[PDB]
């Protein structure tokens, strides 16, 4: 239901209670005084909005500056509906709009916290994508390597770059809830790592060499296969649904 184990742990217990509450209200007693638990919701919302507003002002990521403020409004407005429901139930424990204001307030808080969490996740995924694109671009440089000096420089750059990408993917896949997505990330990453020494070997033969056309074909083939896997990783990293 939630694509990462952080979002799942945080939201799924509360998302299940809200669904249940909606089903109960549809088919179907006095609601007790909700003053103390609503105040706890208010104190948490106030902290989230204050810290959130501070992030909006300091960040350089224009997407956060754009997507975070509407989500705050969503959580703030939903909290206002919750504060109204508790004030209604204190005066009337059998109140009808109070039960609707609780549902509306719960839905809105979950909606806004979901938006916030998804926005933070898209931002982390953008960071991984930048590292992937970096590798893709460095794979395009392979075709201009003509000498052993260049091969040594290329190998010293690509080697650590691949290790950082492999570590980012390994850590991202552990965090995912859907198995089909984890398998695709692991499979593609393994192929990339396996084909890297094969690329360096193909380029060594090219630096060594009719005969040139064969060594060039194999180097271009490896870059093509590695590039296709990297572009598949970029695609899979952006998936939030279904399998």
């Amino acid at each position: 239901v939630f694509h990462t184990r952080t979002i799942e742990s945080i939201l799924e217990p509360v998302a299940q209670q809200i669904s249940h509450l909606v089903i109960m209200h549809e088919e179907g007693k006095a609601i007790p005084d909700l003053t103390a638990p609503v105040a706890a919701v208010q104190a948490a919302v106030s902290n989230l909005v204050r810290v959130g507003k501070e992030t909006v002002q300091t960040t350089e990521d224009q997407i956060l500056k754009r997507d975070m403020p509407p989500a705050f409004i969503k959580v703030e407005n939903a909290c206002t509906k919750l504060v109204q429901a508790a004030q209604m139930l204190q005066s009337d424990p059998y109140s009808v709009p109070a039960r609707d204001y609780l549902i509306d307030g719960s839905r809105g808080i979950l909606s806004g916290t979901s938006d916030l969490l998804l926005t933070f996740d898209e931002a982390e995924v953008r960071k991984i994508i930048r590292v992937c694109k970096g590798i893709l671009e460095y794979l395009t440089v392979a075709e201009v390597v003509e000498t052993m000096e260049d091969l040594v420089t290329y190998t010293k750059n690509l080697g650590p770059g691949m290790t950082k990408m492999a570590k980012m993917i390994d850590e991202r896949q552990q965090e995912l809830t859907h198995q089909e997505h984890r398998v695709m990330l692991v499979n593609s990453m393994n192929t990339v790592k396996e084909l890297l020494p094969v690329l360096i070997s193909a380029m060594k033969i090219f630096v060594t060499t009719q005969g040139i056309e064969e060594a060039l074909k194999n180097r271009n083939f490896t870059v093509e296969k590695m590039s296709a896997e990297i572009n598949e990783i970029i695609r899979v990293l952006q998936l939030t649904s279904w399998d």
Partner: peptide
């Protein structure tokens, strides 16, 4: 992560509110 933790506090408090209703 502070923002994620502040979101967690909100969800935990909301969960407590809903269980207090019935």
């Amino acid at each position: 992560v502070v923002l994620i933790n502040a979101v967690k506090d909100v969800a935990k408090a909301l969960g407590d509110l809903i269980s207090a209703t019935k």
